[PDB]
């Protein structure tokens, strides 16, 4: 729901004005959404942790480098929220920042769960 609303708001920003990196930011946002969906699918598969052992062998590197772009994306969103003066953009960026902060913690607890 939060992803849906935020991505809808960013699409309006993309077309109302020029695509000033917003296109890449949005692409990243759907990438992260699908990534989180895959994590939820694996969590449902938790019923069989045996296959999750190999999936976690992958998740080591996958989590590390995904966390990398997540932290850098949070930094970028903070930077955009700091410089923007348009109310629509400010609301969109604050919602995105809160969502990213929540998702970072979700993936962090999943990472501790699979060690």
């Amino acid at each position: 729901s939060s992803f849906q609303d935020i991505l809808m708001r960013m699409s309006k920003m993309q077309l109302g004005s020029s695509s000033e990196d917003l296109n890449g930011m949005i692409t990243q946002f759907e990438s992260l959404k699908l990534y989180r969906d895959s994590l939820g699918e694996a969590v449902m598969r938790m019923g069989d942790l045996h296959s999750l052992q190999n999936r976690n062998g992958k998740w080591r590197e996958q989590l590390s480098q995904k966390f990398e772009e997540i932290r850098w994306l949070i930094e970028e969103v903070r930077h955009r929220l700091k410089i923007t003066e348009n109310s629509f953009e400010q609301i969109t960026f604050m919602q995105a920042l809160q969502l990213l902060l929540e998702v970072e913690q979700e993936i962090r607890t999943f990472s501790f769960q699979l060690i």
Binding site: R36, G40, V43, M44, S87, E106, I107, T109
Partner: protein, 716 residues
């Protein structure tokens, strides 16, 4: 009176009275009392000489009804109901026939039992006074006097009544009934009118000293007294003074029409300065709840016990910390008060007799927070006139603040659909009329699109909190009472929930008036970090109190939990305003129905299935970078409900003024869109009036921005 007399008297008496008054030269429209008195005099005289005859021999009879037998004298002569000259001629003729004494004054009737003239009198005052007056006026002549009253009293000359007791009783009863009828109608004010012997005077309202002198100084110049002014006005004709004055009038006095075109309007100028901050009595979109699914047992109950249960459901309390200081108050006192609230709630688990309402110990932090630290003393000016720094209470201009984006975020979330119901309305009778069916359709469509609304949650929140505050203020005037912030709702499975938002600690509430302020400290849970929009929380001290644990598909993730603390105040008028927030539902339904009815008057048909049930139709109720955004009917309903709720929730004189003036500007813009050629006389003045109320209120500034967007998009 004029209407009454033409109903209590037969036509002949009224005609005779009118003829007599015309002969005397008076108008009954101005002297109704004299008309009534003369009509009463005539009727009594006729009743006196009725059914009485002189027997053929030396005897009198009282034979009644028609008497064609003839051969009987009438026993009386009517003299009152005749012209002055004719009456005098008749009097002279009868006096000569009987050789009596001609009275100096005109008589009323003549008696054949004794050669004497009878003058009848009806008095609206004491009988003996009237008899004495008549005797003094009528003297030295063999004249008989008979006096009747409206109260049943009577007297004649030397107590010599010249009629049968039955007839006199009939006259007395007639007068008595007339008096009752006048008193019932309120016309018995003529009691004083006939108090001067002659009932011809009109009312007298004089202007004399100290009022004749005030009158002479309250009239246009060049006139000495009010009598000269009356003389001037009485003789006055329209000689054409307005035309001459207009000719002499300067041409700079004009109402010139300045066209209002597509390009004349300009955006409203909003203030500059620090961003505005939140000012509501409770959190709206940052509010967090601790909920319990109370197993039925409806009927409110004990809010303190519900709060205790909702608190027990939560695990995660940590050591309180200040994450965003208030910067205008002692911050350690705020977490001290929070710790005291926690400890006091833990104490209720002791003291076997469980209390229904909790009172907080009056400690230093709680006294400071609740303004218990002595307020300025009510000294007398005669002694403290040398304090130097003695100025007016306000003596300060209102600060200018710029519109922040969080007030649009609040309104966006208010118009959203929640998961709970928040309102259950009572049933009404089954519909039988087609209009009743249309009303039910509109009402049900509206209620279905508004029950699960966040703005409907705010209504219940405000109602509950203000009711609890008023009850505590009335019942616990002299102690610090802990008041849970509680609301109730229903889930999709129709399951009751009690929600805990926070706690209010009331101060000492000795409210004589309806504007007396009771201070309180609000402590409200939230998951919102105060460091993302720190300017929105200028009046709050925010503490980090725990770690809420939220379930998700991937897992159960922990988030920090905060406590927004601030000192606040309220009065009885404000509490009652909060308690009446359910009228916002009525206002929004009334607005939607007015829209439907206005579109129904045109097209001469019921436009109820076109607003609802027509998914294709959409209204412009929002804005994005792409432009104007369209919404469905139910979303329009929720938006109007949220607008009403925020109007009630941020009520201020600035809002009232801005609405009043932006209404006129909106109507001018509409006239431009209707091709009605709008014009103005001072558009700059209207803009100044609109912008004088744009100072620091987030709601009014957001409304001004909304109007600016409307101006951009409407004239395009």
């Amino acid at each position: 009176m004029e209407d009454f007399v033409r109903q209590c008297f037969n036509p002949m008496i009224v005609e005779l009275a009118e003829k007599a008054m015309k002969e005397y030269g008076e108008d009954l429209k101005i002297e109704t009392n004299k008309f009534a008195a003369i009509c009463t005099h005539l009727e009594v005289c006729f009743m006196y000489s009725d059914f009485h005859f002189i027997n053929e021999r030396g005897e009198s009879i009282i034979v009644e009804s028609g008497d064609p037998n003839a051969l009987l004298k009438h026993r009386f002569e009517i003299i009152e109901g005749r012209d002055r000259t004719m009456a005098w001629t008749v009097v002279n003729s009868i006096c000569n026939t009987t050789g009596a004494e001609k009275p100096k004054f005109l008589p009323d009737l003549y008696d054949y039992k004794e050669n004497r003239f009878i003058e009848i009198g009806v008095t609206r005052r004491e009988v003996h006074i009237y008899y004495l007056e008549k005797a003094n006026k009528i003297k030295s002549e063999k004249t008989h006097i008979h006096i009747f009253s409206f109260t049943g009293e009577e007297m004649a000359t030397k107590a010599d009544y010249t009629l049968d007791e039955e007839s006199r009783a009939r006259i007395k009863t007639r007068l008595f009934t007339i008096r009752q009828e006048m008193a019932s109608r309120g016309l018995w004010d003529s009691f004083r009118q006939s108090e001067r012997g002659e009932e011809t005077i009109e009312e007298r309202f004089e202007i004399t000293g100290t009022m004749r002198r005030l009158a002479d100084q309250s009239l246009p110049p060049n006139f000495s007294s009010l009598e000269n002014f009356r003389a001037y006005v009485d003789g006055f004709e329209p000689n054409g003074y307005i035309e001459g004055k207009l000719s002499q009038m300067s041409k700079e006095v004009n109402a010139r029409i300045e066209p209002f075109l597509k390009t004349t309007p300009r955006p409203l100028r909003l203030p500059d300065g620090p961003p505005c901050s939140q000012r509501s009595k409770f959190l709206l979109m940052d509010a967090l709840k601790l909920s319990i699914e109370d197993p039925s047992h409806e009927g409110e109950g004990i809010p303190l016990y519900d709060a205790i249960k909702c608190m027990r459901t939560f695990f995660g309390w940590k050591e309180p910390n200040v994450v965003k200081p208030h910067e205008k108050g002692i911050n350690p006192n705020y977490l001290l008060a929070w710790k005291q609230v926690l400890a006091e709630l833990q104490d209720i688990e002791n003291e076997e007799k469980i209390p229904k309402t909790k009172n907080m110990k009056k400690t230093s932090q709680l006294k400071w927070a609740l303004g218990e630290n002595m307020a300025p003393e009510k000294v007398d000016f005669d002694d403290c006139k040398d304090v130097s720094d003695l100025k007016q209470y306000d003596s300060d201009e209102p600060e200018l603040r710029s519109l922040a984006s969080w007030i649009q975020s609040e309104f966006n979330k208010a118009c959203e659909l929640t998961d709970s119901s928040w309102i259950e309305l009572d049933e009404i009778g089954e519909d039988v009329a087609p209009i009743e069916h249309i009303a039910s359709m509109r009402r049900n469509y509206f209620t279905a699109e508004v029950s699960h609304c966040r703005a409907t949650e705010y209504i219940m929140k405000g109602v509950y909190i203000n009711t609890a505050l008023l009850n505590a203020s009335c019942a616990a005037m002299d102690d610090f009472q802990l008041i849970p912030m509680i609301s109730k709702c229903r889930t999709k499975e129709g399951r009751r929930k009690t929600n805990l938002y926070g706690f209010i600690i009331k101060g000492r509430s000795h409210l004589r008036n309806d504007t007396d302020v009771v201070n309180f400290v609000s402590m409200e849970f939230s998951l919102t970090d105060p460091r993302l929009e720190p300017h929105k929380w200028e009046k709050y001290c925010v503490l980090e109190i725990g770690d809420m644990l939220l379930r998700s598909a991937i897992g159960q993730v922990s988030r920090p939990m905060f406590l927004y603390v601030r000192t606040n105040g309220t009065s009885k008028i404000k509490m009652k305003w909060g308690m009446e927030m359910r009228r916002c539902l009525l206002q929004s339904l009334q607005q939607i129905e007015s829209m439907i009815e206005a579109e129904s008057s045109v097209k001469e048909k019921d436009m109820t299935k076109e607003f609802f049930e027509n998914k294709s139709e959409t209204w412009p109720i929002g804005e994005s970078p792409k432009g104007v955004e369209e919404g469905s009917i139910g979303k329009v309903c929720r938006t109007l409900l949220a607008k009403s709720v925020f109007n009630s929730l941020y009520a201020s004189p600035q809002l009232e003024g801005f609405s009043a003036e932006s209404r006129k500007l909106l109507l001018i813009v509409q006239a431009l869109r209707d091709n009605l050629e709008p014009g103005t006389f001072d558009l700059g003045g209207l803009y100044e009036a609109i912008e004088e109320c744009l100072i620091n209120d987030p709601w009014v500034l957001l409304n001004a921005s909304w109007f600016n967007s409307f101006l951009t998009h409407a004239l395009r």
